[PDB]
Amino acid sequence: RAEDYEVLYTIGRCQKIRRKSDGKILVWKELDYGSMTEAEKQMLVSEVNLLRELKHPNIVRYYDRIIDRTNTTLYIVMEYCEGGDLASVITKGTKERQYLDEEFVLRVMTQLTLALKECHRRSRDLKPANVFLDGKQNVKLGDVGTPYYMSPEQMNRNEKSDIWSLGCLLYELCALMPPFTAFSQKELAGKIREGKFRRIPYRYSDELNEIITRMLNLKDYHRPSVEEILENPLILEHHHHHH
Ligand SMILES: Nc1ncc(-c2sccc2C2CC2)nc1[C@H]1CC[C@@H](C(=O)O)CC1
Ligand SMILES: [Cl-]
Ligand SMILES: [Cl-]
């Protein structure tokens, strides 16, 4: 029950909470369902049950669901990721004019690729705002604007589409900007179809630039598979998750 936890403070509604029994630090996401139709609530139950299923080191862990029919509020209790989201890291870098270490980029590439491999197996938008960092250098995938990560196929007509999006995310991690920018989606679609972009900064190795470039190939069948990505000599044991 909700009484089993103590709210410490609001993060984003998302809140940092402390479990009373053992003092474990978690977060929960608030969801007022008071205004939902029966149909929309059924979908919510099926989705929440979906989330309890997937267990993986590189996917935000969902522990519990708490119903409070009083305020008609649903609480999804989950792992706390002290490093926050990847979008903020990029913003911080953009402002402070400071590029991220290649080591960090390799970690994100390795651990998100493992998250994707798992998602594909059980068959999650892959943007920086949906990628979280914990306290031990681990990277976790969680669950109107310009569609920077839209793939060529998605613009018309596929796991290789996920590879493209990962390519976009990693590219932005390095350059601190997306590979294709524009003011309107039509202009954007134009640039994507051309498939051209700047090389990531020179502080980054040719090998790293090479694989990000491959993920951004116009032909889905030229993009590396999850398996081919992980075979890359760049990727080592220490880049993986550690408890
Ligand atoms: N489980 C989470 N832990 C931490 C955080 C954030 S995000 C930016 C600030 C921080 C912290 C350190 C002060 N966010 C989450 C989540 C929120 C939403 C969620 C989902 O859509 O399921 C992913 C995890
Ligand atoms: Cl550059
Ligand atoms: Cl882990």
Describe this structure in words.
This protein has 243 residues and is an alpha+beta fold. It has 2 domains: 58 residues, Phosphorylase Kinase, domain 1 (2-Layer Sandwich); 185 residues, Transferase(Phosphotransferase) domain 1 (Transferase(Phosphotransferase), domain 1), CATH 1.10.510.10. The chain is 37% helix and 17% strand. It has 7 helices and 8 strands, in the order E-E-E-H-E-E-E-H-H-E-E-H-H-H-H. Helix 3 packs antiparallel against helix 4. The structure holds ligand EQH and chloride ion (2 copies). The site of one chloride ion has 3 residues, from loops.
* Count of beta strands: 8
Q: Which ligands, by name, code or SMILES, are bound?
A: the ligand Nc1ncc(-c2sccc2C2CC2)nc1[C@H]1CC[C@@H](C(=O)O)CC1, chloride ion
- Radius of gyration, whole Å: 19 Å
Q: What's the overall geometry?
A: globular
Summed up, the helix count is 7
The main sheet orders its strands as 1-2-3-5-4
- In terms of quaternary structure, what is this? monomer
Count structural domains: 2
So, the CATH homologous superfamily of the largest domain? Transferase(Phosphotransferase) domain 1
Domain Protein kinase: 5-235
Binding site for ATP: 29
GO cellular component, one term: condensed nuclear chromosome
EC number: 2.7.11.1
Task: List its salient traits.
alpha+beta, 2 domains, binds the ligand Nc1ncc(-c2sccc2C2CC2)nc1[C@H]1CC[C@@H](C(=O)O)CC1, three-stranded antiparallel beta sheet, cell cycle, monomer, five-stranded antiparallel beta sheet, Phosphorylase Kinase, domain 1, binds chloride ion, Transferase(Phosphotransferase), domain 1, retinitis pigmentosa, chromosome partition, 243 residues
